[PDB]
Amino acid sequence: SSNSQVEQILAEFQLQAADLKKVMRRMQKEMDRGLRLETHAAASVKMLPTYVRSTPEGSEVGDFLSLDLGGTNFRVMLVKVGEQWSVKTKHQMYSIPEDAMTGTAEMLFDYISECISDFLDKHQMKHKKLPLGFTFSFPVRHEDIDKGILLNWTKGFKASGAEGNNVVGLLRDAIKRRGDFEMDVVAMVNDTVATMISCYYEDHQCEVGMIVGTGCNACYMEEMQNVELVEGDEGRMCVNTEWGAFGDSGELDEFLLEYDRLVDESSANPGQQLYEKLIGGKYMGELVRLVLLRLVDENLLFHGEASEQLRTRGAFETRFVSQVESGDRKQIYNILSTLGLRPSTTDCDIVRRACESVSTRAAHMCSAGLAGVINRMRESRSEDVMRITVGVDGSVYKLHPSFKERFHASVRRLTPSCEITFIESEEGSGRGAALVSAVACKK
Ligand SMILES: O=C(Nc1ccc(Cl)cn1)[C@H](COCCO)Oc1ncnc2c1cnn2-c1ccccc1Cl
Ligand SMILES: OC[C@H]1O[C@H](O)[C@H](O)[C@@H](O)[C@@H]1O
Ligand code: NA
């Protein structure tokens, strides 16, 4: 049959309750490996200490600048903390050319510094010297709140001279090379962490941050005794899991499919960020493409006919997956339209089913990691039912028509003894860097 042979292929994307439970428990075990001194260095899940600590509430009053780098698109923000407490923000967006992302680190940071300069000119404040927080969305071994070494680029970044170097130093050196303004860089955080802190400001039960964007990652508050990499037992510290690398020691092998290996082999970082490659917005559009090329070379789609755009890597953009999915066949009709194609009414349906297969597997995979984080925190405390708040940001989670609903329901089935509240960050990845800076300044 025509339709059933297609479902057979699509069916491989399914994950049973038991699969997701198995993925979850293994995540918890990799988490524990990343935390312990004995196994940390070999851990796929690095559980990197952030120096962001549980602390009495409050910060300095004043103006704070934040930068947010985590993709081709980035953001400068001016945040005003006033006191009872109020936080007001102003932002601008900047798009980074390919040139600046695949040349040197100096070039990337000079662009960045040019953007800051623009931001300050347009807010009549170029003569002010302010504290600055930096949300830097790549794996970093922190040595303190304001010092961190880039372990490796992810999500397709390549700038040379950065890995192994203090990223804060590179920011400052670029600022000084320009000589057009001055800033005190006082903090550097992951986007998870910034999202968590921005969320915590609104709801003090927010102790987890998650991003499902171009990439996928989470952070959470750990007891200090469990954070063996940092001396001390008292209080809590935020740990940047870098769960994107889950599977990099083979933990997911049984779940990986042909199209996953192919996305991985042609990615900027083969063999790394495998769990992220199942989920992130960087890759979800490409997985879909590769599936359609299977259904075309099975003679099961576009009467066996595939365009030049579809023969070419990157053409099926994650934004398309989101639109396809958002019953009269009209958007689907007008994403395919441009790609040089003529859906039957059946192709519209098939394409939609593919999008949905890849997207559903992402929400389900993602849900298992977060359940792991959440269920581990519950277990570490004295909870029958743990009430917890999770701050979330990212273009997949926000904009993807039903990714979020599928994710929510899957998460909830795996965390039957927690009641979870999701706070969707308006601009948390940037705002949280200002708020951490304000707390850092208080000391
Ligand atoms: O920023 C924080 N810790 C921190 C910051 C800097 C340094 Cl060096 C060390 N630890 C803590 C981490 O909390 C995580 C949840 O347990 O976050 C905060 N600490 C204190 N007041 C905080 C926050 C976040 N918002 N607020 C806040 C509240 C009211 C006004 C302004 C702020 Cl801003
Ligand atoms: O941007 C979301 C995430 O992307 C990748 O997983 C980065 O390695 C990570 O640091 C970041 O939190
Ligand atoms: Na410790």
Q: Would you tell me the crossing angle of helices 191-202 and 428-441 to the nearest 10 degrees?
A: 80
Class of residue 232 by CB neighbours under 10 A (exposed 0-12, middle 13-18, buried 19+): exposed
CB atoms within 10 A of CB 67: 26
Residue 52 beta carbon below 6 angstroms from any ligand 1 atom: yes
Nearest to 185 by CA among 201, 199, 166, 200: 166
Residue with tokens 């795996």: 414
Structure token digits, residue 390: 């999770």
Q: CA 262 from chain center: how many Å? A: 21
Q: What is the rounded CA–CA span in Å between residue 416 and residue 383?
A: 12
**Rounded to 5 degrees, what are φ and ψ at 94?**
-140, 145
Q: What is the rounded CA–CA span in Å between residue 220 and residue 182?
A: 33
Tell which atom from ligand 2 comes closest to the C-alpha of 140.
10
Q: Which helix (H) or strand (E) holds 365?
A: helix 345-379
Query: What are residue 49's DSSP bridge partners?
Result: 239
Q: Which ligand is nearest to the CA of 74?
A: 2
Class of residue 135 by CB neighbours under 10 A (exposed 0-12, middle 13-18, buried 19+): buried
Sheet of 206-212, strand order? 48-53, 236-240, 216-223, 206-212, 386-393, 418-424
For the chain, how far is it from start to end, CA to CA, in angstroms?
A: 69
- 191 and 67 housed in the same domain: yes
Could you tell me the CATH number of the domain that includes residue 328? 3.40.367.20
Experimental method: X-ray
> If you take atom 8 of ligand 2, which residue's CA is the nearest one?
138
Q: What is the rounded CA–CA span in Å between residue 300 and residue 293?
A: 10
HEC string for 387-437: EEEEEEECHHHHHCCCHHHHHHHHHHHHCCCEEEEEEECCCHHHHHHHHHH
Residue with tokens 């699509």: 10
Write out residues with Cβ below 6 Å of ligand 2: 70, 137-139, 154-155, 190-192, 211, 213, 215-217, 242, 244, 276
Known binding-site residue numbers for substrate: 137-138, 154-155, 190-191, 217, 242, 276
Known binding-site residue numbers: 68-73, 137-138, 154-155, 190-191, 214, 217, 242, 276, 281-282, 318-322, 395-399
Distance between Cα 259 and ligand 3 center (Å) = 41
- 164 and 263 housed in the same domain: no
Q: Which of 197, 220, 389, 431 to mutate to test the pocket of ligand 1 (most atoms within 8 A of CB)?
A: 197
Distance between Cα 167 and ligand 2 center (Å) = 15
Give the SS3 label for residue 166.
Answer: strand
- 7 and 119 housed in the same domain: no
> If you take atom 4 of ligand 2, which residue's CA is the nearest one?
215
Q: Residue 432 sits in which domain range?
A: 50-201+427-439
Catalytic residue ranges: 155, 191
Tell which atom from ligand 1 comes closest to the C-alpha of 56.
20
Q: CA 191 from chain center: how many Å? A: 7
- 206 and 130 housed in the same domain: no
HEC string for 280-340: CHHHHHHHHHHHHHHHHCCCCCHHHCCCCCCCCCCCCCHHHHHHHCCCCCHHHHHHHCCCC
- 206 and 180 housed in the same domain: no
- Asked if residues 308 and 338 have their Cβ atoms less than 8 Å apart, the reply is no
Q: What is the rounded CA–CA span in Å between residue 203 and residue 197?
A: 10
Q: How would DSSP label each residue in 184-239? A: EEEEEE-HHHHHHHHHHHH-TTEEEEEEESSSEEEEEEEEGGG-TTSS--SSEEEE
- 109 and 227 housed in the same domain: no
List the resolution, Å. Answer: 2.1
* Rg (alpha carbons) of the chain, rounded to whole number: 22
User: How many domains in the chain?
Assistant: 2
- 87 and 150 housed in the same domain: yes
- Asked if residues 345 and 328 have their Cβ atoms less than 8 Å apart, the reply is no
189-190-196 Cα angle (round to 5): 90
Residue with tokens 């083969």: 270
- 407 and 432 housed in the same domain: no
Q: What is the rounded CA–CA span in Å between residue 367 and residue 409?
A: 9
Could you tell me the CATH number of the domain that includes residue 162? 3.30.420.40
Kind of pairing between the strands at 62-69 and 130-136:
parallel
Give the SS3 label for residue 74.
Answer: strand
Residue with tokens 């297609």: 6
> If you take atom 5 of ligand 2, which residue's CA is the nearest one?
215
Structure token digits, residue 404: 């979020």
- 250 and 112 housed in the same domain: no
Q: Which ligand is nearest to the CA of 62?
A: 1
Residue 188 beta carbon below 6 angstroms from any ligand 1 atom: no
- 17 and 61 housed in the same domain: no
Q: Which of 195, 435, 443 to mutate to test the pocket of ligand 1 (most atoms within 8 A of CB)?
A: 435
- 141 and 277 housed in the same domain: no
Distance between Cα 217 and ligand 2 center (Å) = 5
The 3-state DSSP composition of the chain as helix, strand, coil percent (nearest 5) reads 45, 20, 35
- 381 and 268 housed in the same domain: yes
> If you take atom 16 of ligand 1, which residue's CA is the nearest one?
54
